[PDB]
Amino acid sequence: TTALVCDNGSGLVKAGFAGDDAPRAVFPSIVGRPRHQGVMVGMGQKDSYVGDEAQSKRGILTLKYPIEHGIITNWDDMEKIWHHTFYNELRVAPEEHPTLLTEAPLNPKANREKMTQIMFETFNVPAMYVAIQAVLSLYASGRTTGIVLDSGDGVTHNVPIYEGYALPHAIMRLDLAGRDLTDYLMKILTERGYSFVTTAEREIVRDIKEKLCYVALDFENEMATAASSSSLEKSYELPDGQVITIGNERFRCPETLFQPSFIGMESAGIHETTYNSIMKCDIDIRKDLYANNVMSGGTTMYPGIADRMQKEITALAPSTMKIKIIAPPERKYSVWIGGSILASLSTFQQMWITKQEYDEAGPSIVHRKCF
Amino acid sequence: TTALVCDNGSGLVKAGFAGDDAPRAVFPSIVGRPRHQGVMVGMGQKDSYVGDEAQSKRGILTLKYPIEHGIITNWDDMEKIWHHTFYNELRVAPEEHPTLLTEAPLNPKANREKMTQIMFETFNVPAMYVAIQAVLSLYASGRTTGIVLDSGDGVTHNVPIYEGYALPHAIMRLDLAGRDLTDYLMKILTERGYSFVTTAEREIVRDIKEKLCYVALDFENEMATAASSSSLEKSYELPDGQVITIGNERFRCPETLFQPSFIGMESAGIHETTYNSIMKCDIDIRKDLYANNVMSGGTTMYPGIADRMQKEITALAPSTMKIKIIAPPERKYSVWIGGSILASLSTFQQMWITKQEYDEAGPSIVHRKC
Amino acid sequence: PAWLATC
Amino acid sequence: PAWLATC
Amino acid sequence: PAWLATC
Amino acid sequence: SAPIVLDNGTGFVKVGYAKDNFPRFQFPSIVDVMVGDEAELLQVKYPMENGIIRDFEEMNQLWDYTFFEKLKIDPRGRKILLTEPPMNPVANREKMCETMFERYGFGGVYVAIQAVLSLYAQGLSSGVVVDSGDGVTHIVPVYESVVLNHLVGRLDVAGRDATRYLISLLLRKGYAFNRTADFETVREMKEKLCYVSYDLELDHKLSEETTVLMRNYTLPDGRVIKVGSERYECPECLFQPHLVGSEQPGLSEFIFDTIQAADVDIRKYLYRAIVLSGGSSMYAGLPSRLEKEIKQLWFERVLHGDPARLPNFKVKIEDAPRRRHAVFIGGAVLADIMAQNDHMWVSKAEWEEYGVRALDKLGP
Ligand SMILES: Nc1ncnc2c1ncn2[C@@H]1O[C@H](COP(=O)(O)OP(=O)(O)OP(=O)(O)O)[C@@H](O)[C@H]1O
Ligand SMILES: Nc1ncnc2c1ncn2[C@@H]1O[C@H](COP(=O)(O)OP(=O)(O)O)[C@@H](O)[C@H]1O
Ligand SMILES: Nc1ncnc2c1ncn2[C@@H]1O[C@H](COP(=O)(O)OP(=O)(O)O)[C@@H](O)[C@H]1O
Ligand SMILES: [Mg+2]
Ligand SMILES: [Mg+2]
Ligand SMILES: [Mg+2]
């Protein structure tokens, strides 16, 4: 009767049982459909593909991400991914196991209730609870206060908490994530000369981003050095074999996160919005929030992101106020660790919302029993 | 030998000549600056925009409100707004026109000093003076007794007065007029599905709340009947051509005004602070104020706020005391009408702050004369 | 784009 | 925010 | 074809 | 003493002076040297297959022929502006400016973007422009005389690709033009017998049921060929890139997404003003078909099946007979406007110092 969890992030679904230190299914969340009609008989030729199969045979299948910016867009593709996760990777029937879910803040109540309704009416789950993808990272870190900054492939939000009491009026959210960064990277590569417009090429650009992309303290100094010398030009090979070279783009990409004016957005960066959020709270808790701020989720594994954020927040805040960043190496799976811990806890059991409650009260119950 | 008035609101600004009974030039107090560097050459492009021009063309310009909660924070933008409203909308030279200013009750003395110094130096006017929006809103109706509750765009307050003598130990101020309201409306719209984070979207939300949202009487009963019956869902069109439906947000926004807990504060609603201010006053003026309590300000234009306000104040107040709340039309311009009446009064002329006083005792003279 | 209005 | 300290 | 990679 | 205009294109090249409504000369860039109108047999190059340049030496030969045979001026200082795609790699324009500043003076060029050029030509200050050339097409929005620079769109399927697909179709039918020649004849027959299908299903049923729509076209050698569904099909291969082999949404959906990515307050002003440029846009039935496709895409994505308010859309596409030379007209107008001040240009000086970096003065 052990519980499980499945963080269905916009980048990849992390699904795994509870009471474990690491997940099992780390599989990408993409649905691929064959571009052509297909004529082979008896050798695959399926009408759809999901998971690592798409990433493998991506040169033909047109790809689609079902969820974007954390809101779902294709419920059919979403339930197909859920079926593939539950019946192929985990190899378990959810009828005899609960299912903990995850969602970003300030999301459509319609989306949340539709997720709950489909999970209850399609899989016959006994219970189904949701939560934020930040309190779980906090639990995984093992603290009870501080501010948490998640930068998932779909969204980028920051939330403060003090002794377990959240502050909704201080929560901040932005639609900047790895997809806009990959688009800007493709644009600047076309500027260089290399063209990338398809979906498989988008995945290749995302792999390049995950492989070689950093940040620096003095963006102008780095630009000057890259324009003067060539010590930053790094090489990368492709499946075709024709190697390519990339220059200042590797660090010019995250400047979008640090300067959304590059892509066109008018909102401020992560440092400014974090400072604003902290300022929205009370000073007696700001003093501690400045001392322990944690990073989580993808898009923050870049090397040197800690130093840039530290310098920015220190220049924006008084000097006498000490500041310390928390960016461990186990961040890509921090939300899953938090979900597993919460599912393994004892009291949380009483909070599980079962089937009869939904059947008698409808989906609207999820907006009360949960956050 | 005529006069001039210019009420500088946190959200809007209304200026013109005295004597008249209505304002001449009212427009939003904002500044729009182009964010997308690089334009098509030959056609020419301006550096910054102000007034209705920004609101007319804003998809490319980022907007900035130089005033926040009644306090000034962008003196350059304030000077630009003053120049625009003194040279374009009116086309009058202020060197031969004594002007009049407004200011919330409690504000930085340094802010007032900088305002008067700017108005004296950068314009070379004959004289000037400041006042409180409460006194002018009261002069508008003409009554001299009672309490007045003002609520602009970023600042609100309540002030009593009896036979011309004001009680400074009872004035109350809060920062819940329309800005946190617009923010909470954006939040609830995001909760519903529609996203509004930019400045043009902020103006769109301002317009939709000005046109649709309204306060209720029984918050719980209204929420219940709205969740059960879909008779309150109202549609609104956007500049592009889309249509968006809104339900209980129309109640939740004024409810947030009444219960700042939804915004993250611990202060009490307007009714509680009004009753507290009236309590600190003596008993006779308490009685005389319960009867004549006026509400003004743009935020005050919510349909159904007077009835709910009087209901709450009666429920929390003792009986045998008739509470006749008043809220006449065109109240958002009551400050302008009061300022015009004051400038027209002959006696008030002697209270003008001339240029010699400023040149002699500096700008701090504003306090002594106030 | 997928917010039924803006974005 | 524009009170040189709190808010 | 003449983009030093794709096309 | 006025500047010159030269919008070096994919397969064509048009030249005139700083002020001339209709271009004084226009000739294909096909290629002693035969560069020029002598094509009327030596080797055939076609260097600029797309907005990119490959045989820079052949391009230099072509420019020399144009400046010495079609034109009779060889100056050093006479400003001449240029054109290029929006996101053309910097190397191309760098080499272009380098050769035009070394082999000749041409102090001050200020290369620009065919989108804003055609916009100037039409005498507008807002709207979206969709240029459809021979090797590439692009889409550029503008609002109140301001460029976005972040919603610009590129699409590398037009002209040459449709011609190759028509060749493949005629091959499927039996007729083959494998020779390097006859490419111009196929281009002529395409521009002569082609039209978009307002209703694809209707046109398909007509071609399958009726003998009409089948035309007989002669060739320079003397033989005759028959053309059928290909006529109304090649605009579909233009509309459906997946048919050609590229993974892209198309043209109508492309511009729809590009506009939706903008701010709501601008969207309207873009649906009310839409201009085109390039010979590829002269396909019969293209404007109304695009309008209907945009209307259907809106009806589907936004209203989800609510035709009660569809008439309140107010879409107004624009088209004219001068889209073939809109870029040229705009370049001429801009040259006549900027011929007074030399600061906006890039003189032959300040080149050896930071010449390449001077080219960054245009696009931040
Ligand atoms: N009357 C016509 N109808 C349809 N298509 C035509 C017509 N005339 C020319 N074309 C097409 O237009 C193409 C030539 O385009 P052109 O060279 O004018 O574009 P361009 O201005 O060079 O674009 P760019 O500046 O981006 O290179 C030819 O390949 C031909 O197929
Ligand atoms: N080593 C890395 N360096 C830089 N970026 C990375 C790295 N690993 C993953 N990413 C980025 O993080 C994103 C994954 O986000 P993720 O943390 O899975 O979101 P969620 O928490 O919603 O599942 C990817 O889009 C990718 O671009
Ligand atoms: N009809 C209306 N309904 C609701 N709100 C309104 C209405 N008219 C104005 N407002 C609000 O009132 C605010 C204007 O405040 P205002 O009274 O001008 O402040 P001040 O008195 O400082 O000038 C605006 O921000 C707007 O949101
Ligand atoms: Mg995430
Ligand atoms: Mg006010
Ligand atoms: Mg062209």
Side-chain angles (χ1 to χ4, degrees):
Chain A
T1 180
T2 187
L4 60 92
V5 68
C6 48
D7 169 50
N8 51 16
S10 306
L12 71 165
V13 175
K14 278 83 72 171
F17 298 118
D20 287 5
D21 308 71
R24 291 194 185 183
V26 69
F27 78 97
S29 81
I30 297 95
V31 161
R33 304 188 183 279
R35 183 168 70 250
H36 315 81
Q37 321 312 135
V39 298
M40 189 69 87
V41 189
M43 319 302 193
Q45 296 299 129
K46 296 180 289 188
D47 213 330
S48 77
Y49 287 89
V50 65
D52 296 319
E53 305 184 15
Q55 294 296 128
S56 77
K57 49 172 83 187
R58 66 194 175 199
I60 307 93
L61 311 173
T62 193
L63 301 178
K64 289 186 180 180
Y65 285 74
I67 71 186
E68 320 188 59
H69 295 307
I71 187 178
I72 290 161
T73 316
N74 199 315
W75 288 102
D76 305 331
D77 297 1
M78 197 65 210
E79 59 82 21
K80 193 176 251 162
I81 278 166
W82 278 325
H83 164 278
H84 169 89
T85 311
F86 289 179
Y87 289 4
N88 304 6
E89 275 287 4
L90 278 291
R91 279 172 280 279
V92 64
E95 293 89 303
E96 58 184 355
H97 281 293
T99 57
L100 177 62
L101 275 290
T102 311
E103 185 174 1
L106 309 191
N107 267 31
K109 304 313 199 197
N111 179 18
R112 188 177 295 195
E113 68 189 26
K114 179 59 161 291
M115 184 209 302
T116 303
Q117 165 163 16
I118 186 168
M119 197 72 71
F120 265 113
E121 296 280 11
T122 312
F123 297 172
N124 312 127
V125 294
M128 207 298 299
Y129 187 58
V130 304
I132 314 307
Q133 49 173 354
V135 180
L136 278 47
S137 50
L138 270 170
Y139 272 130
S141 175
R143 307 170 169 281
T144 189
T145 177
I147 191 176
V148 55
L149 189 148
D150 179 15
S151 61
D153 187 24
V155 307
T156 306
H157 56 101
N158 62 76
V159 179
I161 301 185
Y162 193 75
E163 306 295 346
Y165 295 109
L167 300 168
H169 62 285
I171 293 169
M172 278 287 183
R173 185 179 180 282
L174 295 169
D175 292 329
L176 275 292
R179 281 185 203 168
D180 304 333
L181 270 46
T182 48
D183 295 5
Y184 185 61
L185 179 46
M186 296 150 62
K187 277 182 194 171
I188 60 187
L189 287 162
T190 296
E191 200 81 357
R192 283 186 74 84
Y194 312 139
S195 181
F196 292 122
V197 62
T198 63
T199 68
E201 294 163 76
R202 196 192 208 178
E203 298 292 348
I204 285 161
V205 167
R206 179 255 288 179
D207 186 9
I208 280 160
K209 193 197 77 170
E210 297 165 318
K211 199 168 285 300
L212 71 165
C213 282
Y214 73 104
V215 294
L217 282 293
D218 193 322
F219 175 44
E220 292 291 353
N221 185 288
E222 292 296 328
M223 282 198 73
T225 54
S228 75
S229 74
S230 68
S231 185
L232 278 294
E233 301 197 352
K234 193 71 69 167
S235 71
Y236 182 67
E237 181 168 11
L238 306 176
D240 199 342
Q242 49 179 323
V243 75
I244 61 180
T245 192
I246 195 172
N248 57 10
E249 289 70 6
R250 56 193 281 189
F251 73 86
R252 188 139 68 85
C253 172
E255 296 297 339
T256 59
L257 293 177
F258 283 121
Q259 294 194 30
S261 304
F262 283 63
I263 189 165
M265 293 277 283
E266 58 176 88
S267 295
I270 53 169
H271 56 91
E272 189 65 15
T273 189
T274 45
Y275 180 32
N276 300 4
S277 68
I278 296 163
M279 273 289 150
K280 293 261 191 73
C281 308
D282 300 338
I283 60 183
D284 59 325
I285 55 174
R286 287 183 229 178
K287 166 158 190 179
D288 291 332
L289 289 175
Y290 278 127
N292 49 5
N293 55 347
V294 296
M295 297 182 175
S296 73
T299 318
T300 192
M301 209 70 179
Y302 296 105
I305 193 77
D307 298 1
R308 186 77 145 84
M309 171 55 66
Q310 190 273 348
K311 157 164 194 289
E312 285 291 354
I313 195 80
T314 293
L316 270 299
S319 63
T320 179
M321 184 51 50
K322 181 173 174 59
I323 314 185
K324 290 292 299 313
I325 315 308
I326 296 94
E330 57 262 5
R331 322 210 284 277
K332 298 156 58 52
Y333 322 127
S334 78
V335 66
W336 177 97
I337 294 156
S340 73
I341 293 280
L342 182 52
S344 70
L345 280 177
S346 60
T347 182
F348 173 81
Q349 296 180 349
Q350 88 194 11
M351 291 172 63
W352 266 110
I353 183 170
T354 79
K355 170 65 173 61
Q356 54 170 326
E357 302 197 32
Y358 165 84
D359 206 332
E360 66 90 5
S364 176
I365 185 163
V366 73
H367 314 78
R368 326 176 298 194
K369 184 63 67 60
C370 178
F371 168 83
Chain B
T1 182
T2 192
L4 183 138
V5 172
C6 171
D7 174 22
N8 295 110
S10 291
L12 306 185
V13 59
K14 50 196 82 70
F17 316 98
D20 303 3
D21 53 18
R24 178 57 55 75
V26 61
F27 66 97
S29 47
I30 54 175
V31 168
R33 299 189 185 284
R35 74 198 183 188
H36 290 299
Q37 297 93 331
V39 309
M40 48 156 54
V41 304
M43 285 291 105
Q45 172 53 292
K46 306 179 80 70
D47 190 5
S48 57
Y49 290 74
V50 306
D52 58 330
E53 304 298 340
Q55 194 170 354
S56 172
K57 41 182 290 186
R58 39 167 198 274
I60 54 167
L61 316 180
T62 191
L63 309 191
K64 271 191 282 288
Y65 276 73
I67 313 191
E68 289 289 358
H69 301 308
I71 296 182
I72 305 301
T73 196
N74 201 303
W75 292 111
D76 305 333
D77 287 339
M78 178 47 55
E79 292 172 32
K80 188 166 279 177
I81 292 281
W82 279 334
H83 163 279
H84 170 88
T85 190
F86 277 19
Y87 285 108
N88 296 346
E89 276 175 351
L90 310 183
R91 311 166 296 281
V92 191
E95 288 85 345
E96 55 273 19
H97 277 75
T99 191
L100 183 67
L101 272 288
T102 53
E103 178 169 27
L106 300 173
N107 297 133
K109 298 300 106 179
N111 167 32
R112 188 178 294 183
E113 187 204 343
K114 189 66 172 175
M115 174 184 293
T116 182
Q117 157 168 304
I118 287 283
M119 196 61 60
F120 269 116
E121 190 168 6
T122 59
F123 286 66
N124 309 128
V125 300
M128 73 92 72
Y129 186 51
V130 302
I132 313 178
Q133 298 157 288
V135 184
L136 307 183
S137 51
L138 179 58
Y139 267 115
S141 177
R143 192 190 288 90
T144 186
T145 61
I147 197 176
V148 54
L149 174 74
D150 186 77
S151 183
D153 169 65
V155 61
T156 192
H157 53 283
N158 61 51
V159 179
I161 182 158
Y162 190 82
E163 300 292 348
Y165 306 84
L167 281 297
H169 89 276
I171 294 162
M172 297 289 185
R173 180 179 189 283
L174 294 170
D175 303 358
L176 280 297
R179 196 67 56 79
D180 305 2
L181 271 67
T182 293
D183 299 6
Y184 196 96
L185 184 42
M186 297 159 151
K187 195 156 156 179
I188 299 305
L189 289 170
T190 300
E191 172 266 313
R192 268 285 295 276
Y194 313 123
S195 65
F196 290 126
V197 304
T198 65
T199 65
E201 294 165 341
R202 182 169 296 173
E203 306 306 332
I204 291 280
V205 171
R206 172 166 63 75
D207 190 5
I208 204 178
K209 69 173 277 276
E210 286 167 310
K211 201 185 296 193
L212 275 295
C213 86
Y214 69 95
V215 66
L217 191 147
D218 200 356
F219 174 57
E220 306 300 338
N221 197 329
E222 276 294 349
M223 283 267 286
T225 198
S228 297
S229 159
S230 177
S231 169
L232 295 164
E233 298 194 353
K234 200 147 172 178
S235 60
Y236 178 70
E237 174 167 331
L238 274 156
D240 58 355
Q242 295 175 356
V243 164
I244 50 175
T245 56
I246 55 174
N248 54 23
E249 317 96 339
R250 306 155 79 175
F251 309 141
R252 292 173 79 175
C253 289
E255 198 66 11
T256 53
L257 199 169
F258 282 14
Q259 282 68 56
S261 306
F262 301 160
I263 312 308
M265 287 196 192
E266 57 166 22
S267 172
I270 51 165
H271 55 87
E272 191 67 28
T273 182
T274 313
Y275 166 75
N276 296 8
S277 62
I278 294 166
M279 272 288 111
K280 298 185 184 179
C281 275
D282 211 325
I283 199 170
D284 55 357
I285 57 178
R286 268 176 224 182
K287 153 162 184 61
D288 210 326
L289 266 61
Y290 286 156
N292 300 339
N293 173 10
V294 57
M295 55 169 70
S296 75
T299 303
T300 306
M301 223 73 76
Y302 286 132
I305 196 176
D307 53 61
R308 166 63 178 288
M309 190 67 173
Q310 67 174 349
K311 190 204 83 74
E312 291 285 4
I313 204 176
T314 47
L316 62 93
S319 60
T320 68
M321 298 308 307
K322 54 175 180 171
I323 312 187
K324 182 194 174 191
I325 305 303
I326 186 167
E330 64 168 18
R331 62 182 77 84
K332 59 181 180 178
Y333 299 156
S334 74
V335 183
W336 156 270
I337 298 158
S340 174
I341 294 292
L342 191 68
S344 172
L345 289 188
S346 63
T347 300
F348 168 77
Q349 301 295 69
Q350 75 94 11
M351 283 191 168
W352 273 128
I353 315 312
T354 72
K355 183 171 163 55
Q356 286 76 331
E357 295 291 351
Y358 166 62
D359 289 331
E360 291 287 359
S364 310
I365 188 66
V366 60
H367 305 80
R368 296 151 54 182
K369 284 279 212 165
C370 167
Chain C
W3 296 72
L4 323 234
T6 167
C7 174
Chain D
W3 295 72
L4 323 234
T6 167
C7 174
Chain E
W3 295 72
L4 323 234
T6 167
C7 174
Chain F
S1 315
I4 318 299
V5 290
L6 162 53
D7 61 347
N8 190 12
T10 301
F12 278 52
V13 165
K14 314 178 278 295
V15 292
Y17 278 101
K19 181 180 288 302
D20 207 324
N21 302 128
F22 210 76
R24 290 180 183 270
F25 296 90
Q26 68 187 1
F27 48 84
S29 70
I30 184 167
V31 180
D32 43 358
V33 305
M34 202 262 267
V35 297
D37 194 78
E38 271 86 330
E40 50 81 22
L41 281 163
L42 83 172
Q43 43 174 350
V44 166
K45 284 294 212 72
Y46 268 113
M48 296 168 69
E49 80 298 348
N50 294 112
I52 317 309
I53 288 170
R54 299 188 287 187
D55 300 1
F56 44 78
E57 79 295 352
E58 197 62 66
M59 185 54 48
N60 167 42
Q61 291 181 2
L62 172 142
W63 288 332
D64 301 359
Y65 173 94
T66 308
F67 293 179
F68 305 147
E69 312 318 319
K70 312 310 303 308
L71 272 287
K72 311 301 182 180
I73 196 82
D74 183 51
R76 42 175 206 166
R78 204 183 260 274
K79 286 164 275 289
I80 66 185
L81 75 164
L82 292 148
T83 74
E84 63 186 314
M87 49 173 53
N88 172 15
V90 295
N92 191 344
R93 75 175 70 195
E94 201 285 314
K95 282 280 282 183
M96 183 180 297
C97 303
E98 184 175 10
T99 181
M100 291 195 192
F101 279 52
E102 290 180 7
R103 295 201 173 77
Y104 315 98
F106 296 143
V109 294
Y110 178 66
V111 65
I113 297 91
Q114 304 176 26
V116 299
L117 276 71
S118 47
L119 196 56
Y120 280 175
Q122 196 65 8
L124 271 286
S125 310
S126 308
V128 307
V129 54
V130 172
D131 180 16
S132 67
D134 180 25
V136 72
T137 186
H138 60 83
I139 303 94
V140 170
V142 163
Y143 183 79
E144 291 286 4
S145 180
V146 181
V147 176
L148 310 194
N149 200 13
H150 73 292
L151 305 188
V152 55
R154 201 208 181 78
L155 170 51
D156 53 7
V157 297
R160 210 169 293 276
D161 281 326
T163 313
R164 290 175 196 168
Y165 175 61
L166 192 146
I167 284 157
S168 287
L169 287 179
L170 297 185
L171 163 59
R172 285 172 175 171
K173 206 80 76 168
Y175 316 138
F177 305 138
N178 53 24
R179 304 175 67 186
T180 186
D182 309 335
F183 202 88
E184 180 57 25
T185 72
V186 170
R187 192 182 69 73
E188 290 287 334
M189 94 186 292
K190 187 197 76 170
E191 63 184 28
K192 182 169 151 62
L193 317 173
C194 280
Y195 68 99
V196 179
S197 172
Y198 174 86
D199 182 308
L200 177 55
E201 190 182 0
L202 171 60
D203 269 17
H204 174 276
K205 189 194 79 180
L206 178 137
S207 173
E208 197 72 1
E209 294 189 350
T210 67
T211 194
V212 72
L213 189 146
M214 276 182 65
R215 299 296 196 179
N216 47 359
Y217 193 60
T218 53
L219 264 64
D221 66 72
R223 64 216 185 88
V224 177
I225 52 174
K226 293 172 187 156
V227 300
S229 298
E230 317 96 332
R231 190 176 171 185
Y232 85 93
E233 187 62 22
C234 68
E236 198 65 14
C237 84
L238 193 156
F239 268 32
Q240 300 185 3
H242 80 85
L243 193 149
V244 167
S246 47
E247 183 268 310
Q248 272 150 326
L251 172 53
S252 54
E253 174 170 1
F254 200 59
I255 63 175
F256 196 102
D257 295 318
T258 305
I259 287 165
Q260 290 296 335
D263 293 336
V264 296
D265 52 9
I266 295 159
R267 294 179 190 174
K268 203 193 198 88
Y269 285 67
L270 305 192
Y271 294 161
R272 178 170 41 194
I274 307 193
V275 290
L276 311 168
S277 62
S280 195
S281 161
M282 286 293 102
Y283 287 135
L286 189 138
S288 289
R289 169 63 180 287
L290 174 55
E291 177 173 4
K292 166 162 84 74
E293 283 188 348
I294 288 280
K295 276 179 172 186
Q296 289 171 217
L297 182 53
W298 173 270
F299 177 93
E300 175 174 21
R301 300 267 189 283
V302 191
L303 281 60
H304 298 78
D306 197 327
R309 62 182 65 268
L310 179 136
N312 298 327
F313 196 67
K314 190 213 79 187
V315 71
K316 168 155 54 164
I317 197 167
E318 201 68 8
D319 189 3
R322 299 298 191 76
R323 309 319 190 180
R324 184 66 179 152
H325 314 125
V327 176
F328 175 97
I329 296 155
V333 168
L334 179 50
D336 177 66
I337 280 160
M338 271 170 51
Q340 307 297 347
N341 64 312
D342 67 324
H343 180 76
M344 187 61 64
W345 306 72
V346 287
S347 69
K348 192 183 190 180
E350 68 166 359
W351 163 264
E352 297 89 344
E353 308 174 6
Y354 50 96
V356 299
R357 311 305 176 193
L359 298 167
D360 283 308
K361 168 173 66 169
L362 320 188

